[PDB]
Design a protein around this ligand. Structure first.
Ligand code: SF4
Length: 54
């Protein structure tokens, strides 16, 4: 079964970046998954590969 990108390979941190977090993001998948990144991921652990969407 195919794997996501690691939170590491996605450029993540342990806190939000200003306006941007996980939580809902443009890409978050509650309670602990992501559409960019592997699970378990933090509900505030923002990644650099998150979607450029408005
Ligand atoms: S794409 Fe990145 S910032 Fe967005 S929810 Fe997933 S890990 Fe977080």
């Amino acid at each position: 079964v195919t794997k996501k990108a690691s939170h590491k390979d996605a450029g993540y941190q342990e806190s939000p970046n200003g306006a941007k977090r996980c939580g809902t993001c443009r890409q978050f998948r509650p309670p602990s998954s992501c559409i960019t990144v592997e699970s378990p991921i933090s509900e505030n652990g923002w990644c650099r590969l998150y979607a450029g969407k408005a």
